[model samples]
Target: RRYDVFPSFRGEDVRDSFLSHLLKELRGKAITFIDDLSAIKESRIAIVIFSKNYASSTWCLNELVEIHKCYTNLNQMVIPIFFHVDASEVKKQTGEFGKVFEETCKAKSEDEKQSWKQALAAVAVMAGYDLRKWPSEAAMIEELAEDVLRKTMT
Candidate 1:
């Protein structure tokens, strides 16, 4: 059975100082926050996000790959959200993000690179998921939350 919901994002993008506010808003929601490695395995619905600083993080890329794998398994629902980061950067692994993937690719075997490539491709499709381009982050989050809940329950 599905185990409710999970929220996932690059912590470097939204640390305690920033996420605390969002957490307050999300508190009443019936969702689990997957903030660590252990939480991931127990998640049923994951909101995968790329924060502003995700470009510099290999962990974010790895997490995305992991989430994609979970999606493939049909064990969970993955909703990928691109924050201030560019969607192309995630798909192509370009800019600072691309550099990190490039470096990792250097040490990886052909199959591993293929895996990364597949993840990147999957990101391109996931990027098309609901994402808000707004002037106010908090407002956008609230709006998105409402939209998500409304659509989900229907």
Candidate 2:
């Protein structure tokens, strides 16, 4: 695999904070995570960090759609981290998240929104960790790193 994990996150949402901390943990463990669309096809695992503004960014949604496609076609493992957002909000694209998503859709084409919305719902239902369930960011990352490490070994 070109990468062990293809981490998908909205840069403005978590690039410097949660993402960097996760990256450091992964790096310390000798795990690889990068941001690249084509890398998604070659990665063994895909980690999607779904934040409040995640759906609002079309670029993030594009990655998410592709991640879902790869999850099916390539048999790639997908791990979603719902950061400060509920799984239901992502699945139905409703709530505060929906408002942002709806705004984003207004500027995009019909088919684009359809595909993105579908992918969002699909990934939301998958078995993974949720940030809200944890007491602290470090605690969650520690647990997440362990899961990824175990997955990589398989």
Candidate 3:
């Protein structure tokens, strides 16, 4: 019924890359959930990796919306990690980020697109981490894992 963290991201973007590295670091400290809506709601925290093509996936967008709702209504801790994308881009839904967003919404309903946009903007503005700040991936993952561990402890 519960997990320590729910990780949301475009699997094709980071599944074998940054995500795998981060998961390795979080193995012992954080029990990550990526199964279903109930699983996400039961988690104590969420780690959202905003990547280049993250918005293109309807699944990821839907998850982000749910994650934001949990963050606001359930007090679920969310850690938004900008993989190769910028926070400003996600917040404004511009640049490469918006390009994918537009593509994904091209055939979707107006309400759906707006909802996803709001969710992205909400989470992007929250206190989170950006991978661009660090030079090495391992060090970055280590720092993030340490941070996640500390947050979940309380």
Q: Which candidate wins on TM-score?
A: 2
lDDT tens readout by residue for model 2, 1-154:
8789999988899999998899999999999876437778989999999999998889899999999999989999999999999899999999989999999999899999999999999999998989878899999999999899999987
Model 2 alpha-carbon miss at residue 3, Å: 0.3
lDDT by residue for model 3 (1-154), tens: 3677799989989999888888878886645555536677888889999999999899899999999889989999999999889899999999999898998899999998999999999999988888888888788888888888887777
Score candidate 2 by lDDT.
0.91
Clashes of each: 1, 0, 0
Using TM-score as the yardstick, the better of models 1 and 2 is: 2
On the 0 to 100 scale, the lDDT of residue 72 in model 1 is: 81
Q: Cα lDDT of all candidates, in order?
A: 0.62, 0.91, 0.87
- Tens-digit lDDT track of model 1 for 1-154: 2344466666767767445655556556754454454455566656666665664555665666776777787565666666666677777778766776677677657776677667766866663333456657677667656544553453
Least accurate stretch of 10 residues (summed lDDT) in model 2? 31-40
What TM value does model 2 have? 0.96
Screening candidate 1 with a backbone cut-off below 3 angstroms (N, C-alpha, C), the clashing residue pairs are: 93-98
Residue 70 miss distance in model 1 (angstroms): 2.1
Q: Arrange candidates by lDDT, descending.
A: 2, 3, 1
